[PDB]
Amino acid sequence: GSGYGLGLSTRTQVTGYQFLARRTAMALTRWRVRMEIEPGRRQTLAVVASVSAALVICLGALLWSFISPSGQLN
Amino acid sequence: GSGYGLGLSTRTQVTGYQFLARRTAMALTRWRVRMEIEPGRRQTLAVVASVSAALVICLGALLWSFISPSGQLN
Amino acid sequence: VLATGVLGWWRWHHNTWLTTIYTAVIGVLVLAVAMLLLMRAKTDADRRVADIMLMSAIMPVTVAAAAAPPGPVGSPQAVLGFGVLTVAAALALRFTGRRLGIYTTIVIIGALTMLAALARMVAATSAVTLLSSLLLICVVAYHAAPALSRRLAGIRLPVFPSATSRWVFEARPDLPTTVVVSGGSAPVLEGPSSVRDVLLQAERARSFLSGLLTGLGVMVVVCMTSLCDPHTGQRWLPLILAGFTSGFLLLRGRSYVDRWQSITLAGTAVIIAAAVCVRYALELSSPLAVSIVAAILVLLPAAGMAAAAHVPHTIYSPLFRKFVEWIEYLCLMPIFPLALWLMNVYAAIRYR
Amino acid sequence: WIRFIADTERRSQVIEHISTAVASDLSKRFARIDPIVAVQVGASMVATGVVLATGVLGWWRWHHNTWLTTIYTAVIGVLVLAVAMLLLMRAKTDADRRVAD
Amino acid sequence: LAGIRLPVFPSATSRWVFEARPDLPTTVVVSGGSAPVLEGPSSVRDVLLQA
Amino acid sequence: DAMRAQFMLMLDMLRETAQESADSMDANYRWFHPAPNTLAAAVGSPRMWERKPDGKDLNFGVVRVGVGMTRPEVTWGEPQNMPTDIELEPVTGKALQEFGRYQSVVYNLPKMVSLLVEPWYALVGEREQVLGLMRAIICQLAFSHGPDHVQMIVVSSDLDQWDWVKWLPHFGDSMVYTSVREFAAEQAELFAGRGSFTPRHASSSAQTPTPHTVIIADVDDPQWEYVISAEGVDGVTFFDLTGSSMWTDIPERKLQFDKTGVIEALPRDRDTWMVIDDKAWFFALTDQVSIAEAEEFAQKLAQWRL
């Protein structure tokens, strides 16, 4: 057949599928496909922003560690 | 429907409404709508400028307290 | 189930093999009856009967295994118990293909609990840390819920370059499938096999999602109400985290239009506040505390009823509708930065 | 009973694209949330809320003798009763009565 | 506070109908001059008191 | 993504337009050709003996045989400036292709056969399938057309199966035979007098004589060769219930029944009834009535006269 197996694929095919996943995902929760605005994108991006904020803060703490460590006694 | 409730809205709608508000606020104050110049915005930005200058001086003072700490009588 | 209860209470106070050994036969017996009922069952009423019995057999089987390890009850018993529970529920679901909801709920709490106890067993990690991590996994699971539910239901998305060929508009259409009924033996055809599955895949998809939301709901309330504590230092830190989490869930509901799906989200947000309020009154009991808790516990749901009655018949300008939307994103953003603070990770790194 | 039973024969309906097909079908076999149900939910939450408050207030009296428990509960009782009374006078339909009851 | 209502937006889900059936006019009365008179649509007459 | 989204949305509004036209056809075809079990109740209604032969009525001589696939009344215009095969975007490509495959046919519609198109119709399969469809065809003819327009004849040895025929008026005369030798003496003396078969159409219907003859063959007698080798006569139509080699030698007149009751035949045009392919393919799901059901229907019809 066609479409089965692990054949090659292209970058235009990768975005094409992600469009169908987002569109079908809202069809299960909102029962309409109009997609006037795309809230699924925003809600996911918000988590990515949150994680990034967590990563940024912990790197800052490591930078602090080299500027004034614990072993400087006496 | 007819617009009841908390449904989502787009950026084109947000400025669209805000423009209808400025034009009506002028009508109650000057009784004309020709609006060759729009003094309503101008008077508002001057306040925003005032708030911004005050906050910068607050941050400067807060930052100075960390650069060379001190204290006060109680 | 009541029998397994007293046997459990005994095992909770005595270190004898009685419960594991004596319960095993009890489970096997009910399971045997259930197997025959499933074979002999043909009508819908029988299936209801068969399902109830089968569901009852998993409980004794679960506690029996959990009670198998010797010595004081603890970390390893939990791993064994929730473990077989997870496999049993999943296994029952796969072959039964019925009661999708209730079985799915069991699978998730088991799986996450299995991963929780396993960590406590392999490493001396505190409950504080072990609970905060469960909170984060559940937060991201809500965003995954609509997608994860797509796979289990069997929806497939085709993408290929049109078979490396130009289109054929006059292609011979697919053959319609014929269907029959036991009494109404005269057959009738309804349509292409490819299209009928969608009408069935969709009904199945709705059930997996409803369960997945319920299972996650239980976990967030149990974890959150455990993190906040009235004696632990910096009392306000774990409490503020409970506030934003509640806000996020409460607003997220309006992405779901289904009746029971939406109420479970709203309900999940309200019950977390109520549950913390009770815990904060019993311990560290005092006149101000009980006076305060009693007020919050009655004003909060009251305002809710007020909002529910008036919002559907009033008009709001775009600048306000756009403002409530942004609260949701503002609520999600602080969860990760705070959870790590409560877990002392930043202090741990700053002092390496 | 002698009865007339109509013909059930009619055309079939097909939608090929998976997302549109899921949305169409899923909207005809289930019920969506509506304002009528929202109010009943609101009433149910307040009822559950007050029984929890009286519970904790009672738990204090079982260990303390002050008037606090009776004083605090009396005002809540009067307020809840006052609202219920006001609603019963305004109810027009059975839906409203379920809220009031 | 005076209740001035800015027009509600169509939310981008329907086309405009250029000429729907016109809105019904409203009647007014006076006791001494018992003969009633009519003057306009309800939506317009209110603004003159609203301002 | 915005362009893809808008393209999908525009495609669904066309779908609604197609579905609305589809509903009109369902209502229209059923209104002229109901299912056999419902005709009994309609006997008193004015819909009985309604059909006319006078050229404008295109449904004259048409009989419902079952349910199956049909081509809708829509006419699709091909897309302008079609991009070359290597230039097509993947998402919209399959969409326009599958749209074209499914929306080009509508499922579960009533299929029909016209007596004005063939000298005979060979029924091949098990006895129950063959007799069931014949009983259905007979009652459909009997409800829509009056005795001043249709007359029927049966030649069979298994008279216990054709007993119910007694009540219908269309089997009267100014009538069941045991063998061709018997049929040849009484009936063939009248019919052999003139003509040979000639396929007709609606406009031509105004010229053919009013009484059309339907003949049922259930004896397998080799003596039938005389009229069959002469390619019949106009105003007659034969149904072979036996499947004899002399009738079964033309695929264009052979209807094959599967184990599931599905009929296969060569495809024919909805507007011209002309054969469009030389390979047999799915045609319709068989509709059938029992002997008791047929006699019940005949008794209700037997109560009325001009």
Residue numbers in the entry:
A (entry chain B6), B (entry chain B3): 10 to 83
C (entry chain D1): 152 to 503
D (entry chain D2): 102 to 202
E (entry chain D3): 303 to 353
F (entry chain C6): 101 to 274, 285 to 416
What does the paper say about this structure?
Specialized protein transport systems—known as type VII secretion systems (T7SSs)—are central to the virulence of this pathogen, and are also crucial for nutrient and metabolite transport across the mycobacterial cell envelope. Mycobacterium tuberculosis encodes five homologous, but functionally distinct, T7SSs that are designated ESX-1 to ESX-5. These systems translocate a number of effector proteins across the unique and impermeable diderm cell envelope. Here we reconstituted the ESX-5 T7SS of M. tuberculosis H37Rv in M. smegmatis to obtain a structural view of the entire T7SS membrane complex from this human pathogen.
To further investigate the effect of MycP5 on the entire structure, we analysed MycP5-free M. tuberculosis ESX-5 complexes from the same preparation. These assemblies contained the same EccB5:EccC5:EccD5:EccE5 stoichiometry as the fully assembled complexes. Following 3D reconstruction, we obtained two MycP5-free M. tuberculosis ESX-5 maps that displayed resolution estimates of about 4.5 and about 6.7 Å. The differences were most notable on the periplasmic side, on which the six EccB5 copies showed high flexibility and did not form a stable triangular scaffold in the absence of MycP5. This shows that MycP5 enables the trimerization of the EccB5 dimers in the periplasm. In contrast to the periplasmic domain, the cytosolic and membrane regions of the MycP5-free maps were more similar to those of the MycP5-containing particles. However, the MycP5-free particles displayed an increased heterogeneity that affected the entire complex, which resulted in a slight waving of the membrane region and an increased angle variation between individual protomers. Complexes without MycP5 show disruption of the EccB5 periplasmic assembly and increased flexibility, which highlights the importance of MycP5 for complex integrity. Our MycP5-free M. tuberculosis ESX-5 maps are reminiscent of the hexameric, low-resolution negative-stain structure of ESX-5 from Mycobacterium xenopi, in which the periplasm was similarly disorganized in the absence of MycP55.
